Design a protein around this nucleic acid. Sequence first.
RNA 1: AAACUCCAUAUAUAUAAUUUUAAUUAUAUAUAAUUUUAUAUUAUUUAUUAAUAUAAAGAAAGGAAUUAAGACAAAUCAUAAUGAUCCUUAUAAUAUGGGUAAUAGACGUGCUAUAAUAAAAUGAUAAUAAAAUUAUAUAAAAUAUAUUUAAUUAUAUUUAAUUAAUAAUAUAAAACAUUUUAAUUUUUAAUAUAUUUUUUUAUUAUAUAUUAAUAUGAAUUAUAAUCUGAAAUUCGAUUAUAUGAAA
Lengths: 50, 111, 55, 403, 53, 119, 51, 49
Amino acid sequence: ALKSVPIPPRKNATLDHITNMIMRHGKKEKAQTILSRALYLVYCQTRQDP
Amino acid sequence: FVVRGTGEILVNGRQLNDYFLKMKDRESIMYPLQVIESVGKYNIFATTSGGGPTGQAESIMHAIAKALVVFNPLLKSRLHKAGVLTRDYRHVERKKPGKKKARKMPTWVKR
Amino acid sequence: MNVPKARLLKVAELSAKIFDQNFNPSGIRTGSKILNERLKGPSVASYYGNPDILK
Amino acid sequence: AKRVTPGSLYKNWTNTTHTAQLQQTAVPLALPIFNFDDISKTLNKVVSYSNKQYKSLHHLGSFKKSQFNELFQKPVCLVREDATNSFLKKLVSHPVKKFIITGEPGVGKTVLLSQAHAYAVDSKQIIINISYPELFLNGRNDFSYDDDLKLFIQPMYLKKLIRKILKANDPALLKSIELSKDYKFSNANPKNASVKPFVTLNKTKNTVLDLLSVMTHPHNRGKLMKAIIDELSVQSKVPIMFTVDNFSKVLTTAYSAYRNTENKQIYSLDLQMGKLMMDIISGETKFANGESSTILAISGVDRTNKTLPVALGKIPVDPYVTRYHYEPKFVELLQKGNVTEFEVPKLNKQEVNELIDYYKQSNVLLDKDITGKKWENLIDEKYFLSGNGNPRELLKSLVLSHR
Amino acid sequence: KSLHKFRILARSRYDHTTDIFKMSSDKFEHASQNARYLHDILQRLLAESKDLT
Amino acid sequence: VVHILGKGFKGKEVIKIALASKFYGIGKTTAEKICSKLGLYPWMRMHQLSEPQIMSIASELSTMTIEGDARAIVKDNIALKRKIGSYSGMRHTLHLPVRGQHTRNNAKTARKLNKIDRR
Amino acid sequence: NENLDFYSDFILRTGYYLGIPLTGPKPLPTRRERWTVIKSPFVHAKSKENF
Amino acid sequence: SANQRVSSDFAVRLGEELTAIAKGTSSAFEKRDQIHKTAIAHRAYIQLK
RNA sequence: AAACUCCAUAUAUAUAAUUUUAAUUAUAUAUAAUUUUAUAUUAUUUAUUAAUAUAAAGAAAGGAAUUAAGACAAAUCAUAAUGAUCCUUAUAAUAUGGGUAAUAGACGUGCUAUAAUAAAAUGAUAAUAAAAUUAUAUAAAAUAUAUUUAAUUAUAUUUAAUUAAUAAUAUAAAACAUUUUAAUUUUUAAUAUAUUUUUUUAUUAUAUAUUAAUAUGAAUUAUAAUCUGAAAUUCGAUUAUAUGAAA
Ligand SMILES: Nc1nc2c(ncn2[C@@H]2O[C@H](COP(=O)(O)OP(=O)(O)OP(=O)(O)O)[C@@H](O)[C@H]2O)c(=O)[nH]1
Ligand SMILES: [Mg+2]
Ligand SMILES: [Mg+2]
Ligand SMILES: [Mg+2]
Ligand SMILES: [Mg+2]
Ligand SMILES: [Mg+2]
Ligand SMILES: [Mg+2]
Ligand SMILES: [Mg+2]
Ligand SMILES: [Mg+2]
Ligand SMILES: [Mg+2]
Ligand SMILES: [Mg+2]
Ligand SMILES: [Mg+2]
Ligand SMILES: [Mg+2]
Ligand SMILES: [Mg+2]
Ligand SMILES: [Mg+2]
Ligand SMILES: [Mg+2]
Ligand SMILES: [Mg+2]
Ligand SMILES: [Mg+2]
Ligand SMILES: [Mg+2]
Ligand SMILES: [Mg+2]
Ligand SMILES: [Mg+2]
Ligand SMILES: [Mg+2]
């Protein structure tokens, strides 16, 4: 059963890159929160997947 | 300690959410149980010690991958290709004697 | 800290007498640390070795 | 310059989401209406509050920020047998009716309080709710000393509280309660007060509605609050449900941020608000109605000490603990009131399933979870990622975990 | 009662977790003197603890 | 705008912080004591003062060392040092550091601020 | 470590023949002291050596 | 572009810009067109190399 | 040169009565990789082969030391030692004070800031480390003090245990949650308003200025105490009440 299923992705690539661009001084949770907060906003205003 | 059951986890006797605030640490811990689609079939009892949260979480994930092999030995490759069965040798490198924090040097003046 | 201070200090000086220990309830400067400090003279004096080494 | 146009978001994230009307774009999903008398049909199933319940709860402050409500057109709840049904059965059957809601941060203590409020509204009850006790402990409201009451009075906080009590409870019950004794308050009406210096209320002719609707001067607002509590305590017609959320804040800061004329902190029990709260908890007020209850809830945002666990009998009494971490007076005041503990349990697998399902129906999930992931795997993984059933963490993983 | 008095007079020298009394001495310049000093202090504490008058 | 002893205050700033800032001689603690003595809640603003309250603040704040009095005390202390003939007085006269700092480098702010008529 | 281990082994043998139960050499953690010093005699502080 | 907004939290301002872009309303597109027009203005110098 | 070497890594054996506990460890010996195998797409001296990718077998990926011959008459006679030359009542030896800390200018290194992808408070079943130190000692807990109930911070009172896988230095801090934060009228409060209640809406007040130093920033200085020392003026370190430059 596990053959046909691909390996689940390591981690999203574009989101990792964007976080790393925001991230600075080694503070990644702050960057992820900022990005996740913004994406939560854009969904609430557009009701489309961010 | 991995024993079959439902998706229950405990770190040092505490809940996963209490111990690991970051959701990425929980995701890393759960990845082995996700490479193989058996997230809701095993009970984890993690007893990490040493280092900071990410080192603990990633050591838990590595230990889980090692423990899952005993349950189905012909699932080793899937985990190996997933990279969870390799030990991350990366670690802090010693502060070099004549310079600042290792691999950094004080400002060099031409004249 | 419900227990009255009188009881606590009664235990304090009783133990002090039992264990041969100073009791200074008021906190005045008794200068005890001056006397109790160890003498380091023997060690400092032999910094340069035995002067009676054969020549 | 103007800078901020009339339509624009300028506050931080939490206040922006809390107050921006982001629920306007939410799809109007149809759900069964909350009703304890029909618990058999709404059990283990998401529900929406009744319109009158929504009005009363909004006026009581049962819905707070950081609850993700803005995701949906209106706040919704899940009827959890272990948390909602069990608690309400205990509340109805137990004779003392004095509880404190406890649980891990984010488990849903507030929600359970709001469900209790919904029960009270639909059971023809009067609700007095202290949503954020910090407002009368943080030193951002006026205060004065009333020698007649021997307590410090906070007129702004009172005015808001009576306003909330008036606008939350149905006028029918407040009218149905007649005053047991006369009152004579100063008059502060913008126009009438020029002619009439004082306002009088008489027995069996005016109700508590008129008492709530009167307007006096700040130094007498404490008299009005004491009268209101006494009137509702003596009357034995309607039950009174006194609720306080974030009670751990009260239990931890025994001393407020107010300083008297000698630059000394004003003990909490020297305030009127703290005193009446503790009198109700300890049973000194002694409401006459049998069904009158007192439900308290703690919040994780507030520090923790040895006060509450000792009060709840969870740990013994160590008398050498500093007052900053153990307040014996509050412990004996809580124990004297026979306040019992209710622990909100974490979600199980099936509860998570229902919640996530409803989230799917509301179009609040990512396509990675929906478009591609198996439902079973999704539920299990989220159950794992949410610390085995923490509702806040579950919501965070679904809509606030873009990674 | 004597045990409670003994425990509260030992102060930091007694740990309730394991119930072990603990005491060391090196003021005197020989082991024999320190052992006698410790024994005498233990006798003194026991005598006072048993005196509940 | 609230005027206390000739000091201009905006209507938005807290009493304790504003008092501690504008007046020479009263700091955070003194302002807190002043506000507490007159029964103004900790985070009260300058808008909400009434005329009696402003008068009380001005009256009670005028029974302690005023800006001018405190400046006089400082200047008198410097003058004492200089008239005695002490080393410190000499540094004050020459616009040089007085607390044993190095002059080979820096010592700019001392030259700019140290003097016999220090504010 | 070589002399330590050899002597330990000897201690165990002597104890056994003397009737003394002995558990055996337990490896307590080693202690690493560290000093640093400039290699040059006069002035090359950039060059340092660890002992 | 998101740093030209009045809020004090960049999560809010990032969200506002992203929402605006999602509806095709922002000045960043002009920069993209300018770069492409410049690339066209430099058609013939590309070489296989 | 590379390799042997050391730190680190994976595994095996041994030791430890799992109260020196942690066995998730410590340290002795050994094995392991300067990875192997297969396939294909390449250019080629034609697989009697290289790089490109794939596959599968693996835990397997780093750092440190070692910097040759000669050249720079590079540095060192102030680590120490010797040759030559020079002083020998002085260029040798001791003590009390001062200087090495002076300040026009200039200069190389750094520390701290100039605010909202950032500063401050709080967080007691005390979130989570590693490596080092304690017979010329480390110094807990409790106390009085400033200081209010307490906590935090700094002294004083007294030395608990430990000369160490045992006790102390020592509850790591960022992280994360809550509250606050001037410029900012984007704020407060006075009334009403209400299905945004820790909150929205309407009216009035929230003035006087503009490229600006704030509730940024802590330089300079006044005073009172404290620590070490026999001694704190030239010339030491902390705390408190004021000061609050430049940026
Ligand atoms: N639908 C639904 N959401 C719930 C329920 N219980 C909790 N939640 C959600 O879980 C989160 C936390 O709920 P709260 O009631 O604030 O939890 P709490 O434990 O009282 O929170 P703290 O006081 O901060 O510890 C919010 O997102 C709630 O909406 C429930 O029964 N139904
Ligand atoms: Mg580092
Ligand atoms: Mg809550
Ligand atoms: Mg001032
Ligand atoms: Mg063990
Ligand atoms: Mg080599
Ligand atoms: Mg060479
Ligand atoms: Mg050459
Ligand atoms: Mg030369
Ligand atoms: Mg020379
Ligand atoms: Mg020489
Ligand atoms: Mg001489
Ligand atoms: Mg020098
Ligand atoms: Mg240098
Ligand atoms: Mg800042
Ligand atoms: Mg260690
Ligand atoms: Mg070690
Ligand atoms: Mg201490
Ligand atoms: Mg901590
Ligand atoms: Mg300027
Ligand atoms: Mg400041
Ligand atoms: Mg200061």
